[model samples]
Target: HAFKPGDLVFAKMKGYPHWPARIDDIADGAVKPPPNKYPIFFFGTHETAFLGPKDLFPYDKCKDKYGKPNKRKGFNEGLWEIQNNPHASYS
Candidate 1:
């Protein structure tokens, strides 16, 4: 297997940068898209899809240019928490 299940990787798609993703499962005999592919769960959009070896790359390959895996905008976390939790009372 090019990548085992739960292995973190960077998956590429048309018009999109390599997004953080985790290998979910093998796509054995499922289709002929690549004959060798795996289902991956995208971290950014919480999306899932089957991508072949050519479309997947080691996560560490992006560290030098991208900084870190969990890096985010300075205030995005707090802002996201407020937006996602509608029931939380805020001033």
Candidate 2:
């Protein structure tokens, strides 16, 4: 999906510093090859989280309503949840 600034995005955990975020900006970069063949998605957030297009999935998958998810179900051996931030503090 083509993303622009102000779009909400979710980050797939690969390592440290993983979190959900909103797109604040885009950048010019070379696309990755092989199985991953999409232009990167650049974004910013209140916390320290950086990701590419492949690193992000649709935030819509987490929500069934305007600002919340339909379920807080856990999956993948309880390694991940639909709601990563249950009590997110907006600053």
Candidate 3:
């Protein structure tokens, strides 16, 4: 099934590798199409919570990656990865 908020997704991380992430948000950029807020998806991780759709792929068909995986796949686990989860503020 197509993913939505609270679902796990495979997102491409630039300068990083494909990671297992929980869908945290899907922002409309805030403004309008062609604008900054046109349409963008946000994924979750202890290291980073915001990611682009182009950088994301389905976990089942995940394509490429330059990183390693364990729990969050390419990312660290919760506070173990970072001190504060900024994106965690939303959900």
Candidate 4:
């Protein structure tokens, strides 16, 4: 795969063409076949999707200007606890 666990990536879904997803987790190793998987964070929230390499794609940055925040990063990159304050943001 071309992405690692923190690199934001574009992926294909069941019904839609594309979605901006973050690689949250990866398989431990290749002890067996068909075991490679990439756990992705999506749905503008915490919902995750596990997909193989074929499912990933590219997204138009122009269409994704209003991207969502990473909750695991402590809310808006650790700013929501501070009310998503731009000045106090920790992104």
Best by lDDT: 1
**lDDT tens digits by residue: candidate 2, 28-70:** 3343333333332222223433455776656677433223322
Please, what are the lDDT tens digits per residue for candidate 1 over residues 2-91? 687766676777865666666765543354344676776656465568888888877557635432434443223332332354223232
Write out the backbone clash pairs for model 4.
none
Superior by lDDT: candidate 3 or candidate 4: 4
TM values, all candidates: 0.59, 0.39, 0.42, 0.49
**Model 4, 12-52: lDDT tens per residue?**
66864455556664453333224666776653334466777
The number of clashing residue pairs in each candidate reads 0, 1, 3, 0
lDDT of 2 at 12: 58
Which residue pairs clash in candidate 1? none
Candidate 2, position 11, lDDT: 53
- Candidate 1 ranges with C-alpha deviation above 4 Å: 26-34, 66-91
Count: clashes, candidate 4? 0
What TM-score does model 4 achieve against the real structure? 0.49
List, residue by residue over 1-91, the lDDT tens digit for candidate 3: 5446554445555654455555544452343333221122333344334555665565445423422434543255532321244235433
> Which candidate model has the greater TM-score, 2 or 4?
4
Give the per-residue Cα lDDT of candidate 2 at 63: 34
Provide the global lDDT of candidate 2 against the true structure: 0.41
Q: Which candidate has the highest TM-score of all?
A: 1
CA lDDT, every model vs. true structure: 0.57, 0.41, 0.43, 0.49
